[PDB]
Amino acid sequence: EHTYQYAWVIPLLPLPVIMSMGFGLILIPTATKNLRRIWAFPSVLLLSIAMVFSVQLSIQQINGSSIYQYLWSWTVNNDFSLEFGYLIDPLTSIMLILITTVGILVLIYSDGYMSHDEGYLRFFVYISFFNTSMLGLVTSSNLIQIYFFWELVGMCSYLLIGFWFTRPIAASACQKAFVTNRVGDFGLLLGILGFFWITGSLEFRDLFQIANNWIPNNGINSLLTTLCAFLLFLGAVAKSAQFPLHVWLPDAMEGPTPISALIHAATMVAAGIFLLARLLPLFISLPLIMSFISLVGTITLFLGATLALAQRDIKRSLAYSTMSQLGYMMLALGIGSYQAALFHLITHAYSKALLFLGSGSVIHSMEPLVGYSPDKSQNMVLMGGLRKYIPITRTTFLWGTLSLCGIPPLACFWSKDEILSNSWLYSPFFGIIASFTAGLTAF
Amino acid sequence: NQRDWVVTKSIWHLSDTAIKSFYTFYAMFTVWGVCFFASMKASMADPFYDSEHYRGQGGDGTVHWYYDRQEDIEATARGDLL
Amino acid sequence: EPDLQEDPIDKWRTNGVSPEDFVYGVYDGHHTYDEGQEKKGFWEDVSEWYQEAEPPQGFQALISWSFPPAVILGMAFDVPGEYLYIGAAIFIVVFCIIEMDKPDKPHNFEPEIYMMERSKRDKLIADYNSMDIWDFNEKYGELWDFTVN
Amino acid sequence: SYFPWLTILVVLPIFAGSLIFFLPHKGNKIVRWYTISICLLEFLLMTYAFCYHFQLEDPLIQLKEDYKWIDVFDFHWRLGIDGLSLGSILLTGFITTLATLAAWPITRNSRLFYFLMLAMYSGQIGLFSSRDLLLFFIMWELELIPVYLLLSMWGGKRRLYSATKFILYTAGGSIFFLIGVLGMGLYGSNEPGLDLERLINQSYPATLEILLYFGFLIAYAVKLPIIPLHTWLPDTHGEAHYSTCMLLAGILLKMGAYGLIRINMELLPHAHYLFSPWLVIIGAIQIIYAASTSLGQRNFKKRIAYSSVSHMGFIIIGIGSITNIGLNGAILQILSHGFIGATLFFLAGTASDRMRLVYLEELGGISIPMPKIFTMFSSFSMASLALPGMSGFVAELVVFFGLITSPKFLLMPKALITFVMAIGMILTPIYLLSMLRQMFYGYKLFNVPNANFVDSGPRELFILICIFLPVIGIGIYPDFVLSLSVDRVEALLSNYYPK
Amino acid sequence: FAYPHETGNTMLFPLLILLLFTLFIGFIGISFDNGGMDNGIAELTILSKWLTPSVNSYEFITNAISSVTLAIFGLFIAYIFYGSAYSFFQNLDLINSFVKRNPKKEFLDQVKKNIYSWSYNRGYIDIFYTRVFTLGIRGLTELTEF
Amino acid sequence: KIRNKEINNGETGTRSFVKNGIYMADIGPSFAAHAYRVRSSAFDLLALEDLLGKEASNYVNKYLRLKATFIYYDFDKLITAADPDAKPPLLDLANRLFDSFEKLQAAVTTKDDTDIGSCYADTKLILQEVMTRM
Numbered sequence A: 001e002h003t004y005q006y007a008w009v010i011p012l013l014p015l016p017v018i019m020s021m022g023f024g025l026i027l028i029p030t031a032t033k034n035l036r037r038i039w040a041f042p043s044v045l046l047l048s049i050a051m052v053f054s055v056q057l058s059i060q061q062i063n064g065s066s067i068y069q070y071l072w073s074w075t076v077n078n079d080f081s082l083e084f085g086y087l088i089d090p091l092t093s094i095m096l097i098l099i100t101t102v103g104i105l106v107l108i109y110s111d112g113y114m115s116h117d118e119g120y121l122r123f124f125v126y127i128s129f130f131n132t133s134m135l136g137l138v139t140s141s142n143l144i145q146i147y148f149f150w151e152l153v154g155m156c157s158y159l160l161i162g163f164w165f166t167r168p169i170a171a172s173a174c175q176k177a178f179v180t181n182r183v184g185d186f187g188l189l190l191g192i193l194g195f196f197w198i199t200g201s202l203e204f205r206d207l208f209q210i211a212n213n214w215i216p217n218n219g220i221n222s223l224l225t226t227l228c229a230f231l232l233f234l235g236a237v238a239k240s241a242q243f244p245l246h247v248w249l250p251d252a253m254e255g256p257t258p259i260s261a262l263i264h265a266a267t268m269v270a271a272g273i274f275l276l277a278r279l280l281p282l283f284i285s286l287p288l289i290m291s292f293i294s295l296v297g298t299i300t301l302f303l304g305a306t307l308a309l310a311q312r313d314i315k316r317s318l319a320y321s322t323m324s325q326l327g328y329m330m331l332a333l334g335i336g337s338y339q340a341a342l343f344h345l346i347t348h349a350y351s352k353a354l355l356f357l358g359s360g361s362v363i364h365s366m367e368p369l370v371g372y373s374p375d376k377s378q379n380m381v382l383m384g385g386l387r388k389y390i391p392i393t394r395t396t397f398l399w400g401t402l403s404l405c406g407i408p409p410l411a412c413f414w415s416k417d418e419i420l421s422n423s424w425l426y427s428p429f430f431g432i433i434a435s436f437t438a439g440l441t442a443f
Numbered sequence B: 001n002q003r004d005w006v007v008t009k010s011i012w013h014l015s016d017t018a019i020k021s022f023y024t025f026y027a028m029f030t031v032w033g034v035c036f037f038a039s040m041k042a043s044m045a046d047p048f049y050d051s052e053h054y055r056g057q058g059g060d061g062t063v064h065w066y067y068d069r070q071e072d073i074e075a076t077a078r079g080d081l082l
Numbered sequence C: 001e002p003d004l005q006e007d008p009i010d011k012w013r014t015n016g017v018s019p020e021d022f023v024y025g026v027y028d029g030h031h032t033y034d035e036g037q038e039k040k041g042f043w044e045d046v047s048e049w050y051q052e053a054e055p056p057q058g059f060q061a062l063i064s065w066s067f068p069p070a071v072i073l074g075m076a077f078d079v080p081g082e083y084l085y086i087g088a089a090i091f092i093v094v095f096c097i098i099e100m101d102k103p104d105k106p107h108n109f110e111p112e113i114y115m116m117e118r119s120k121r122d123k124l125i126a127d128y129n130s131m132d133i134w135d136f137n138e139k140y141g142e143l144w145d146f147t148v149n
Numbered sequence D: 001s002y003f004p005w006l007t008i009l010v011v012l013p014i015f016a017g018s019l020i021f022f023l024p025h026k027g028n029k030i031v032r033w034y035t036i037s038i039c040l041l042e043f044l045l046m047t048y049a050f051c052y053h054f055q056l057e058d059p060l061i062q063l064k065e066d067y068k069w070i071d072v073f074d075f076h077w078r079l080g081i082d083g084l085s086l087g088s089i090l091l092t093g094f095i096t097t098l099a100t101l102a103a104w105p106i107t108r109n110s111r112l113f114y115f116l117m118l119a120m121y122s123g124q125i126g127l128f129s130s131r132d133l134l135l136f137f138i139m140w141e142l143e144l145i146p147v148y149l150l151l152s153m154w155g156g157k158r159r160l161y162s163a164t165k166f167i168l169y170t171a172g173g174s175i176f177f178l179i180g181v182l183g184m185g186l187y188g189s190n191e192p193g194l195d196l197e198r199l200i201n202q203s204y205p206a207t208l209e210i211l212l213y214f215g216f217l218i219a220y221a222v223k224l225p226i227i228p229l230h231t232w233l234p235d236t237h238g239e240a241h242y243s244t245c246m247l248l249a250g251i252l253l254k255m256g257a258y259g260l261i262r263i264n265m266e267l268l269p270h271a272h273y274l275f276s277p278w279l280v281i282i283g284a285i286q287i288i289y290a291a292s293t294s295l296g297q298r299n300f301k302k303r304i305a306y307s308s309v310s311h312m313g314f315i316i317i318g319i320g321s322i323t324n325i326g327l328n329g330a331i332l333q334i335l336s337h338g339f340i341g342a343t344l345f346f347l348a349g350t351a352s353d354r355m356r357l358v359y360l361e362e363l364g365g366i367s368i369p370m371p372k373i374f375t376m377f378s379s380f381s382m383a384s385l386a387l388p389g390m391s392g393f394v395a396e397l398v399v400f401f402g403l404i405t406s407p408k409f410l411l412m413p414k415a416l417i418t419f420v421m422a423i424g425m426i427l428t429p430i431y432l433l434s435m436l437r438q439m440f441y442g443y444k445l446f447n448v449p450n451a452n453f454v455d456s457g458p459r460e461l462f463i464l465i466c467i468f469l470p471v472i473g474i475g476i477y478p479d480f481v482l483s484l485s486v487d488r489v490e491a492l493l494s495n496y497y498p499k
Numbered sequence E: 001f002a003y004p005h006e007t008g009n010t011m012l013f014p015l016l017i018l019l020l021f022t023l024f025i026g027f028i029g030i031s032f033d034n035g036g037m038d039n040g041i042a043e044l045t046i047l048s049k050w051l052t053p054s055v056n057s058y059e060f061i062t063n064a065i066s067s068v069t070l071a072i073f074g075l076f077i078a079y080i081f082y083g084s085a086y087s088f089f090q091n092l093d094l095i096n097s098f099v100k101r102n103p104k105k106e107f108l109d110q111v112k113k114n115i116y117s118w119s120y121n122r123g124y125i126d127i128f129y130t131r132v133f134t135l136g137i138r139g140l141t142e143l144t145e146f
Numbered sequence F: 001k002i003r004n005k006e007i008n009n010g011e012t013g014t015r016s017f018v019k020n021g022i023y024m025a026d027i028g029p030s031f032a033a034h035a036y037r038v039r040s041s042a043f044d045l046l047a048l049e050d051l052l053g054k055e056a057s058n059y060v061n062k063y064l065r066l067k068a069t070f071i072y073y074d075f076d077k078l079i080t081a082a083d084p085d086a087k088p089p090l091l092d093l094a095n096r097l098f099d100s101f102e103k104l105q106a107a108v109t110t111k112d113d114t115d116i117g118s119c120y121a122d123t124k125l126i127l128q129e130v131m132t133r134m
């Protein structure tokens, strides 16, 4: 269908609310903060449209089509030009569905959650801004213009981590959770500039062609094209939580629970995996990187696995579990069969967002019995045994954690089984490690 | 135009165009000649720079006035003279 | 002036100037589990907040409110620029000669003259605002002459 | 056209401020309005001259004129605007009007003060619009006394030491500039010599190019802080009133870059082309050294001063690495820093004077009493972090692109220097958020009493918003400040001779 | 003396609607053995991950069996250690034996004394960046000051 | 500071619109990495007169120069790396294009409205044919 030249309104769809609240939140602080719950409706509705404008954009791709892209020159000066615009390929629609669905759901869950709080409107503004930035990142034509959104989602995650900005730990975790992905985007920018010098272009349609086939022989650049790509891989690592850079997710889970469920299934996985999956056409000419990706995957996998043990904080053990799960995606990408890695990511997104929301509900349910205190709540050793008291929020936790463990009828099973098969088919060297972690997680 | 790239692993084709504000870079500066409206938001009341909890108007006056200590030593000398 | 002294020097990078998060004397009692619902609507709240400046009062408001809808329309049904930059020019002059012809308030003047014995009133109000150039009360030679009744 | 604009644009502020003297009217009130009206009139005349009396399509000089002034050493009223000048002229008018507004509640003297403000205004525009080298020098040193008076009358605890160090240091730095003036003035004075336009064709002999180049470069490194010549900045910034410091660290610094662009790269190519790589190296190491010493400071005013120091490495590296965009990205950088540094110093001076605590360790949780300051402070901190969207990003990006595509480099330092430059992005947030966290986050004592703690009123908030909006407007679509077609002739001279 | 009663009426609707997702999504790549149905023309055996680029297998059967075997083994040890006893899935006969003749309790506990000591130390790599990086730059700033 | 190795595009008074000082990354000598960048650059000057065809064409002579210098250099690098037979007609093609570019630049430098489009019609007709002879 021709429903593409109007698709550019997707990443800009919720924006007409954000600027219409922040202004009110800055100029007239005592009026907009009195239309408290009403402000939820114009947002959850608007973003909703995006979702129904995405399935029809994705169903087409399912029926078989050709991807489009639109480029516009936003600089014409002396001796070069700069472009912007987006593209709609299978992966774009996949991540689009996966972001807008969890977004429209976590918005309602937040309306339920943050109802006694004070920063209601500011919270909604932050959520909508992060959402309209992520929706922008996933649909982006040339490298420079994805870098323009990478750091935006980084800043959004920063502002969301230290949300309450008054708990003296949430003031010491946001800084780290910013500096880590700052190192990541540093590596990303260096790799971008390297590939630019090497190939002379910025867009994929030309980069994938030039870098693969035509390049001079060992004028030293070979070492550069081995090095520069490692920097892009380092950025994609740091936005996710792999071995060398994982120290920001466990403590970053200090923020509010809905944000803890949106920065562990919506951005933590997307900005990490998605970029590597899109740049895969490049890495097939660099077997070294194909091996190093698999190695860091099967390192961070086992490391995240063996740290969920004995961690008696639910909103912390969940983060360790989701890092150990992203290990599996990082491994699966390192063997070519990403067609199952994306499926595993789609399953794990929901299978973890459900658990985070359930944990938030359990905390707020038991929080009146023990004092209003983290580590006095959310510490499941003085909690324990709630099947009798809150059933409707218990069956969901069970049927999510079993799916995550791996059972045929449920989800998150047909994906990790396929990727374990492919791992064993590659080599036992870390196939055995994958097989062992597949049981440690079930534990 | 609408060039149709048959890439070696997928099903691309693209369409691009060049745009740039022709000369409205003058009109936007003329509109941003709204700093001549910086007079309604200056005649408004001052928050506390006119409040009774303020006396001394320099950049270090109120902070480093702070030499009534000398005057107090002098008052001590005078009281001793009394 | 007593200015008591100091004590066992604190961490150079003290994490957040705050009470260490042990005696943080409520978790969730300082920021979140706090709100109720009281009152006060929207419009009678807005038009009770644009008037804690008395920003203009009279004519000085008409020439300040009807100006933006005349310099946003100007970029349509276009009129030459010369007309547009004398319009904003005669504004910045008319609005100025009405401001500087408003009365004076005690906070406007010097610090050493701000603090009188509450005779500042009949020294400034109705005393300054009732003459043009008289300098009978020219006490800006500070040695505390005070030259007034 | 022959109706002189630039002459009016230079002699309007100081003249119409000379009437503040000999005007016995009040203590403080009427002078504020009489000064802000003149400032707004000047800015409006500036934008009227720019809009309908400029072309953006020809690299010559516009609105030029000259006279006869001293006639012994040929020195005229020669005056003319050009592409490079225009951006800085507009930025000067804008930020100085807004600084004069930010100086609203000053009643200490309030008569010498606004007059000195107008004098600095006229001097800045005179320099930025100059066309005769000696007149450029005159306008350069004319402002040296007003700034000293503004320092020594208002601002900071130890105002005196800062003021005297600043004045002595700058006056000494200008000596090498005057040396260069005497050097290239006497070089065939029959050929005009002192007409900055007719010097493009001068062919000086060797071993003299270098001496004049260095005589100008030393003065510039004095004005624009370069590593071994930066010790003066923290004292003359941490002690200045925020009203002064806005225009000081937003305009007066950028003169050291505008002059270096105008009289070095345009007049002495084979004295600058054999000295560009060391400029690039110095800027590259400065970008990291300034930040690594900023993180160490403990009073946030000096931290902001050092953050202003750091961004002056992008300008350097853009002046070297001779390309169209590298030189062109420098101009966008000086604009996007004249915005950000000025606003950040205004915010620092506005948060202070409310808390009376300068050391960053005792600053409690100021977010509870005053939210709007916290918001507009975090926003501009993000801007200074080179965050995308805001204009602090595209400048550095174009600087990178200029270095990368440079012709006077072959891939060995073209990568290591890029690496050491990108370390700045890892380093800057470490010291910006370390301040944002100590001074704003955390819950201090129950600072409920609404006394000596009031959020920004209408004036300060409007100043913040009116400076902020251009940042977004430029960072979203940065062709409002790429109206520069002189570089297509500025970088035309250099581009083929040896080496 | 209070009790953990249910939460509000708004934090359950998304939980339920997403539970509806965590079971159906498995039908995207459902299987590779005739799909699963001869009717149901809604993309039965053409598994819906066709957006991607451009009996059952005995080997895959045995691989999935090994996978679910390790899964149920982990679940079983978890239920042995943490699970309750009032149910019927903790036989407790063996439990009544693997405390009576526990041979290696003198050694096993030390393993405990290791493993927990690790996880509480947060995977020591965290402390590494503390005692190296944020204590390296803290001295580097002092050096470049002096 | 860059030279040419097939001097037949330089017409009388050998020069052109070209704006030296543009960085063109190394692609290797081959009649596959030049006939591709020449295409994907000659694709832009089709999209040129889409928006910036009218409406103050003062940037057109700032982008045509740019995205035609690429063609001017890569086409020489190409016409070198070709067999003897295909060189005469490819050169003939080169001649008609790099003359229409000079004509278009000289016409647009006059700030006209209909002359610009009438001239652009010819460079479009020829430039749509360049994307096929490759």
Ligand SMILES: CCCCCCCCCCCCCCCC(=O)OC[C@H](CO[C@@H]1O[C@H](CS(=O)(=O)O)[C@@H](O)[C@H](O)[C@H]1O)OC(=O)CCCCCCCCCCCCCCC
Binding pocket: A171, A172, A173, A175, A176, A179, A180, A183, A244, A245, A247, C013, C015, D426, D430, D434, E129, E133, E134, E135, E137
């Ligand atoms: C596969 C093999 C892998 C081998 C290892 C590879 C590791 C690569 C990444 C290095 C680890 C990065 C962890 C970042 C953690 C963090 O952000 O801490 C947060 C702290 C916060 O600072 C502090 O923050 C404090 C608050 S708090 O303590 O953080 O809460 C604050 O109080 C204090 O003032 C402030 O200083 O950040 C720092 O102190 C330093 C930041 C890290 C600086 C890194 C510079 C770039 C390194 C490149 C290395 C290249 C190696 C190869 C060279 C050829």
